[PDB]
Each structure stands twice: as C-alpha cells, then as structure tokens.
Design a protein around this nucleic acid. Sequence first.
DNA 1: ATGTGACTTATAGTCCGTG
DNA 2: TCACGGACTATAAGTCACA
Lengths: 77, 76
Amino acid sequence: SFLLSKVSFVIKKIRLEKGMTQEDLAYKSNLDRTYISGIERNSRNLTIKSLELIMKGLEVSDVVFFEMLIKEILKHD
Amino acid sequence: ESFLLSKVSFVIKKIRLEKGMTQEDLAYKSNLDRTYISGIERNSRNLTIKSLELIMKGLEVSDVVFFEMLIKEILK
DNA sequence: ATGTGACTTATAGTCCGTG
DNA sequence: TCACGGACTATAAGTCACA
C-alpha cells in the first residue's frame, strides 16, 4: 500500500519536528507505544478514527496533516 | 461520533453521486460489498486507510483530488 | 435502488516482554 | 527510547437475510 507509507512518513515527520517521543505520542493519542512504532516502521493499516487520534496527539490540524500528505503524494523522481 | 469519519463518509458519497454511480456500481468497481459501502456512507463503519484506497480507486478519483475535497469539507 | 442487524473471519490495536 | 516479537482482545472486513 502506497497511501499507508505516505501517512506513516508524515506521522513520523511531524512527531520529530515536535520533538516528541513515540511514548509522548502514544499517550496523547490514547494508543499503545508499540502501535506508534508499528505505524512508523511498518506503515500499519490505521483506521480513520485512529488517524484522527494521532493528528490530535501531534497537535496538528487535520487540514495541515492532509496538506503535508498531499505534498508527500506529489513528491516525484 | 467522529469528526473526521463524518467528513470522510460525506466526501465518498458526494463524489459517488457526482460520478452518477450507485453504491452497487461503486461495489463493482472497488470490489467491495454494496451493503459495506452503505454502512460507510451512513457513518457507521470506522474504515481503514486500505479500504479507503479501494474506494478511491473505485470512484476513479486520485488520492490528491480526494484529499483536496476532504480539506474543503473540513473547512466548511 | 438503499438500509440495517446479526453474524463469521481477518486484523487493528493492546499488553507483555527483550537487547 | 525504540526496534522488534509473542500472544492476546477489541473491532474492522466481509456477507447475507431481510426491510
């Protein structure tokens, strides 16, 4: 899956920009630390609701997240 | 009771009706069961990103177009 | 046509760990 | 702190019999 690797790239990018650990993100997302790791390393198939939890844990608006996703989708060569 | 979910379901339906397609046509094109797509449009199915990809492919819409439409629906 | 409850099967997502 | 794995539970995927 093409889209999952882009979602998971954007998640890890924002997390690092915010200086958050995977545990910080797990805690603010109401998700397990190993699930955050799984998402980032293995581009796990998130639900819409868990994606929403994560964007909330990253403290980014949905719009900003989806604009970054679009950027990552349009990246080429 | 999810803000994002209600926006995603509204966009899938909006594009489906824009393409003049029935849920059954969408089922055919996405290889998903029509009663499964009904549940999504009715906001009663927390779909994964994989399922959303099959739906977007079924709608013959690019990810970028779908996301731009989702952004606009979020801003309304 | 679409909608829905009530399922079975597959997997999202949690919990217990390690080096 | 995080990659990685076993084993588990909660819930999504997928289906159908109605409505």
